[PDB]
Amino acid sequence: SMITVNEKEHILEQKYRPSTIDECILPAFDKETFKSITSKGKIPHIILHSPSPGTGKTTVAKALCHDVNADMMFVNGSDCKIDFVRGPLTNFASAASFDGRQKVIVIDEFDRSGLAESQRHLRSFMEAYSSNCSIIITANNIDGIIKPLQSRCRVITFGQPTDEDKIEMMKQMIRRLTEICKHEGIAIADMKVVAALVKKNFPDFRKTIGELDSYSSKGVLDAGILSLVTNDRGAIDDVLESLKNKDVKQLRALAPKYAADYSWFVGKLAEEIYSRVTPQSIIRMYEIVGENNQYHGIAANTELHLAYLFIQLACEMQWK
Amino acid sequence: MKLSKDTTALLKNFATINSGIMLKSGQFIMTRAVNGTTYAEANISDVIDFDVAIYDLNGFLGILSLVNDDAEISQSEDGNIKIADARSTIFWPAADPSTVVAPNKPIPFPVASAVTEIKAEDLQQLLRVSRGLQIDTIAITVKEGKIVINGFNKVEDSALTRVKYSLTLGDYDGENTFNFIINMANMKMQPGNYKLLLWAKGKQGAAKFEGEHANYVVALEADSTHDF
Amino acid sequence: MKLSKDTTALLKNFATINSGIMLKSGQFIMTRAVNGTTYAEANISDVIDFDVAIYDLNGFLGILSLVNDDAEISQSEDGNIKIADARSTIFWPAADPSTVVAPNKPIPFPVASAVTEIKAEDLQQLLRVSRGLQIDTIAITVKEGKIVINGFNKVEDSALTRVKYSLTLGDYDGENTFNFIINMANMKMQPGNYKLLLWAKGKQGAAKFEGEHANYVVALEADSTHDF
Amino acid sequence: MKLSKDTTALLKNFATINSGIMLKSGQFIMTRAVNGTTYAEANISDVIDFDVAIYDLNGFLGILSLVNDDAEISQSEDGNIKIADARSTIFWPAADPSTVVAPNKPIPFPVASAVTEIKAEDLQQLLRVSRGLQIDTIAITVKEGKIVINGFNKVEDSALTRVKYSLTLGDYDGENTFNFIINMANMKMQPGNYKLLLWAKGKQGAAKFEGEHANYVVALEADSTHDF
Amino acid sequence: SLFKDDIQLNEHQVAWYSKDWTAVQSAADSFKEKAENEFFEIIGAINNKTKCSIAQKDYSKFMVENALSQFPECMPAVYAMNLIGSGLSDEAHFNYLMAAVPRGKRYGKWAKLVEDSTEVLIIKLLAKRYQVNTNDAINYKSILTKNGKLPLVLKELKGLVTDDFLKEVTKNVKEQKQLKKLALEW
DNA sequence: GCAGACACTACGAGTACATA
DNA sequence: TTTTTATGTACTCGTAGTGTCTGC
Ligand SMILES: [Mg+2]
């Protein structure tokens, strides 16, 4: 085959984690920028950041190492404290390589806040040790990496693909999903389903595979499972529909339903009405909901105070 | 009941396994790590004349260090613990045997799979070095029909590759290939010579340290490999 | 003035009562606690030849260890301190007396309202056990005709009812019922033998420990009940 | 090759000077500080048979202080350092000289510009006092026809105007005027006696300490004021 | 500095190779360089009616709210977000302001008061001494300055200027200049 | 016996959060 | 051409100062 299987594990988005730098689904320029690196043979100081989880960051790190036959220390970013940097990180850099192997240090998920000192400390560690080894950093939020590090490092941002890189990258993944179904023994009756999984989750390939796991429950991806993946989210639809229609009997009825977590429901409402209503009705929905929110918890009957929000909205909110 | 510097000794040890302990009437004490990584058991001199749950085992072992050897430990009329020293009396709590993690029964080992031994002297040389050498993971395998231990540093080589340390334990008589990997964190046992019985069935397996005084049984780790 | 092994022993103890000290010319010194809860006088074998205040008494006792026994302190070229070694010289800052807490008079204790005794051995057991059991308060009273010391955790006790520790000391030949209460952080005195003199007039009361080296006087707490 | 208590004890001291060392075949061992400010040299019984850089110097010796004296130290089959104990073996990482720094050549010492010596107890006092007085810098000059040392705290003292500590070494028989300033960081020397040798030419100079087991050369800073 | 051929190693190599972590510390500390706060990119987005670039970022409802408070034209919609702000999506709060504050422009300077911190001292030292609050402490300064010249009150009170109290009044060596100033012209 | 070395404590700085 | 409200609470990091356990 062309695919890697780890076979030591059952969790399937991790059974199939790519081995080389080729196996990866990356945008054009980035993938090349990576081959080019494994060509010149020695690895520069790199920071890899998503922030969407599961875009390949920590995979592309492990790969660069495989492709350079590097001697690697994989470390938990949250475990890398000042004494680690002084300690087994310096122990490592300074101790000798007769293999003629690029020494690479992978610091995975380095974006924590209290590591500010470990970070300032590394940025210096780099100047003294730079020629023994090299450092690949994985982060979700770059801002959690001190600016003096983003400086000395090549910073490659995953997750923001061009419009064409979106189109190809998904093709590559539809193909990849099908291949995993070949091995795991899943049958594909309707393919529109494998395309659904990929479009639906796109920036994140990890959930994208996971959702392949949970929807294979029966062992076939069929036209019915299509209906589930595709099917249209939020259950605030009943209230949104009643508000458009400006009726009460229905709204009056839904109030006691969401009386349970009011704090959550008010959020999901502000979220989904903001898109579905006119611009100057937007300025009002905040006044209406923002006030209703303030006085909640003063309000005696929560169910009723929720009804009073529904009526207030149906009148003033307008839209198509 | 009365506790002897010998047994107060074997307990400070079971404190490095579970912060608490369950001891029921008898000559026999067991404990197990809360996360099930380590199980200890022993038979003792001093005789245990009532049941009780001890939440703090290491701090009460700290408070029994302040009385005379003659001190008389009794359940308190009020159900806690009374330590009567000669000129003095101390009062220490009991928790219910629900909040201390007891094993059910004294887990019997299976028929072993391979067996070697280790001398007291050579246990010292391992523990004591691990600190310096940063050996946090070790492996019992065969080399030249003679079983060796191997120290590694798992953070430096995640792959257990550059072996920083080794100690040859005795001749290997049977014929099987194995790498058993033990986390230095589970090695909690006190020093001295142990008969070593290890067992493996596929994704099953365990290592029993059979001491003179107490027995120790330690979990292997998951990258452990073997055919048995 | 030179200082001996026996002299700095005390002072190293007085630094636990009050950070600094003010000593005056003579064979006698006292630190008193700042909050005024506890106080210590003693008489020594060396003679002080001038008045000076020391704000860091610990710090100073430390630099002393590093000089020979023969060493000579004396007022240095400016208002400040000088320790003259055989081969070298060391200067220590001389505190402005605004900065150090002086006792203000050698409090000449009353006639003992009751006398008992506590051994080097017992005081030792108390102080330590106090730690393990979080015992921050003790109350001395009579139990079955002997003078007993009791102790609790005034935090989780508050009533001083549940008794964590009891110590028998000696017996009581008088006929009067008293319960005397001391704050434990007020018990700072070097190890060893003390004659304990309790004294109480109504809402004022105290406790003097007569040691073979120094004397100590601790405040009784408001809760003390008695008939005297 | 094997190591002697003598050659081990010597080494740890050399560790305080540099975290590592570069040694080669001989009976002669040496380190220099990386910053260039301090250097050492010593000759011992035991015989060095292969060139090796170490990395954790204090570490290598740690392992050593565990195994026997019978410990034989070879070059590992992989270019690391292999150490052979009774029933066992240990590989210490072979360092990478890219990192390590040691003396290129043992540059020797110009004849003494001026000569004195310093007693065992007297080096000690200096060091242990530097702690309690926070002295980071000292000065050797002459007051009243004798050669003495002066401890100052450079953080509160810009101009080293205020002297906390002075050490008299016995009289000066030369006629020259100097003020020489060393950093307390760079005084790594071990206890026991030292003949002192001070050399200067106007913008550049040093000090060599010649003891029963070693020699040390620490460099003077800028504010040294000197003639000739 | 011996040996006179050392390929001068950088600040860091010296530190690390020799292993004195306080050198390592001055070295690391060298990169301290702390500012950030792209807050004005969000604020200016709300004024100049541009593309959001948010919820990906860290929003201060208070920064924004307050920055906009500079301009009287915004107040109606800053105020609105005051009474109603608590319990609005950090995002909702941004969507409102965008749909609210109409024109756009702002130049920087925010309003702060004048502090004669001579005078701030005298007031906090009356407030402490008498366990009265600030407004009364005021009346105090006036009837002292007016009558009794209050050098005396300043004289008796100077005793406690405790340098920690100083940590409350101003933030810098101007604080150590007061330490002396109240200890002076009474 | 001390001094040295290890372990555990605590405070200061940083960070982030929610209600007013 | 910018730039930090008040009151309480919680988690983590780092270091320095305290202890006890150990080795000539
Ligand atoms: Mg990851």
The Cα–Cα gap between D115 and D158 comes to 29
- Asked if C163 and C152 touch (Cβ cutoff 8 Å), the reply is yes
* Minimum-distance CB partner of E17 among D34, D39, D219: D34
Structure tokens at E38: 């792209």
CA D14 to chain centre: 6
Q: Which residues pair with B206 in a beta bridge?
A: B199, B219
- Among C168, C117, C162, C180, residue whose Cα is nearest residue C144: C168
> Both ends of chain D: CA-CA distance in Å?
48
- Among D134, D160, D168, residue whose Cα is nearest residue C62: D134
Any idea how long chain C is?
228
- Asked if E64 and E94 touch (Cβ cutoff 8 Å), the reply is yes
Provide the residue type at B11 as one letter. L
Q: Check if CATH label 1.20.272.10 holds for domain A230-320.
A: yes
Q: Is A210 annotated as a binding residue?
A: no
Tell me if domain E1-34 and domain E113-186 are identical in fold: no
Cβ contacts of residue C142 below 8 Å, gap of 6+?
C148, C172, C177, C178
User: What are the chain A neighbours of D79 within 8 Å (beta carbons)?
Assistant: 96, 98
The Cα–Cα gap between A57 and A61 comes to 6
Distance from CA of E127 to the nearest CA of A (A): 36
CB-based contact A51 E56, cutoff 8 Å: yes
Structure tokens at C170: 């000696």
CB-based contact A290 E85, cutoff 8 Å: yes
**C window 115-134, beta carbon within 8 A of B:** 122, 125, 128-129, 132-133
CA angle C166, C171, C176 (to 5 degrees): 95
CATH number of E35-112: 1.20.272.50
Structure tokens at C204: 């004022």
The Cα–Cα gap between A127 and A152 comes to 9
Burial class (CB in 10 A: 0-12, 13-18, 19+), E141: middle
- Right CATH for A163-229 from 3.40.50.261, 1.10.540.10, 1.10.8.60, 3.50.50.60: 1.10.8.60
Provide the residue type at B191 as one letter. P
* Minimum-distance CB partner of D87 among B129, B163, B168: B168
Cβ contacts of residue B23 below 8 Å, gap of 6+?
B29, B48, B51, B52, B54
- Asked if A133 and A94 touch (Cβ cutoff 8 Å), the reply is no
Other beta carbons within 10 angstroms of residue A56's beta carbon come to: 21
How many domains is chain C built from? Answer: 1
Cβ contacts of residue A11 below 8 Å, gap of 6+?
none
Query: Strands, E, within A51-159: which ranges?
Result: 71-76, 103-108, 133-139, 154-157
Structure tokens at A261: 């977590």
CATH class of the domain comprising A1-162:
alpha beta
* Separation of A142 CA and G21 C1' (Å): 46
Cβ contacts of residue C77 below 8 Å, gap of 6+?
none
Judged by DSSP in three states, D89 sits in strand
The Cα–Cα gap between D85 and B133 comes to 15
How do the domains of chain A map onto residue ranges?
1-162, 163-229, 230-320
- Asked if B119 and B204 touch (Cβ cutoff 8 Å), the reply is no
Burial class (CB in 10 A: 0-12, 13-18, 19+), B31: buried
The Cα–Cα gap between C153 and C134 comes to 6
- Asked if A177 and A206 touch (Cβ cutoff 8 Å), the reply is no
User: What are the chain B neighbours of A92 within 8 Å (beta carbons)?
Assistant: 156
- Which element (helix H / strand E) includes D45? strand D38-48
Structure tokens at A196: 């659904």
Domain residues for B168?
2-228
- Asked if A63 and A21 touch (Cβ cutoff 8 Å), the reply is yes
- Asked if B86 and B66 touch (Cβ cutoff 8 Å), the reply is no
What is the A35 CA–ligand 1 centroid distance (Å)?
A: 21
CB-based contact A88 B134, cutoff 8 Å: yes
The b-or-e profile of B166-193 (16+ CB within 10 A means b, else e) is bbbbeebeeeeebebbbbbebbbbbebe
Judged by DSSP in three states, B85 sits in coil
- Among D222, D192, D223, D195, residue whose Cα is nearest residue D210: D195
Q: Which region, left, alpha or beta, applies to residue A109 given φ > 0 means left and ψ of -120 to 50 means alpha?
A: left
Residue of chain E whose Cα is closest to the Cα of A273: E92
Do strands B88-92 and C21-23 pair parallel, antiparallel, or not at all (unpaired)? unpaired
The Cα–Cα gap between A154 and A36 comes to 14
The Cα–Cα gap between D191 and D127 comes to 10
Cβ contacts of residue C158 below 8 Å, gap of 6+?
none
Using the structure block, give the residue that is written with the tokens 């530190």: E15
> In what order do the strands lie in the sheet containing B178-183?
B225-226, B178-183, B137-143, B146-152, B165-171, D88-92, D81-84, D72-75
Q: B58: domain CATH number?
A: 3.70.10.10
> In what order do the strands lie in the sheet containing D38-48?
D26-29, D38-48, D215-219, D204-211, D194-201, D114-118
Structural biology method used:
X-ray
Other beta carbons within 10 angstroms of residue E54's beta carbon come to: 17
The Cα–Cα gap between A123 and E33 comes to 13
What is the A112 CA–ligand 1 centroid distance (Å)?
A: 13
The Cα–Cα gap between C207 and B62 comes to 30
- Among E112, E116, E119, E144, residue whose Cα is nearest residue E130: E144
Cβ contacts of residue C22 below 8 Å, gap of 6+?
C51, C53, C54, C97, C100, C101, C102
- Asked if E101 and E73 touch (Cβ cutoff 8 Å), the reply is yes
Longest dimension (CA), chain D: 64
Do strands B21-23 and B194-201 pair parallel, antiparallel, or not at all (unpaired)? unpaired
- Which element (helix H / strand E) includes B216? strand B214-219
How do the domains of chain E map onto residue ranges?
1-34, 35-112, 113-186
| Strand G: positions under 7 A of a protein C-beta atom | 1-5, 11-15
Q: Residues whose CB falls within 7 A of nucleic chain F?
A: A 113-114, 116; E 62, 86
CB-based contact B165 D66, cutoff 8 Å: no
CA angle C172, C173, C174 (to 5 degrees): 100
The architecture in CATH of the region E113-186 reads Orthogonal Bundle (1.10)
CB-based contact D89 B133, cutoff 8 Å: no
Q: Check if CATH label 6.10.250.1260 holds for domain E1-34.
A: yes
Instruction: Please report how the helices A262-276 and A237-244 are oriented relative to each other, as an axis angle in degrees rounded to 10.
Output: 50
- The DSSP secondary-structure symbol of C94 reads P
- Which element (helix H / strand E) includes E165? helix E163-169
CA angle A90, B133, D5 (to 5 degrees): 110
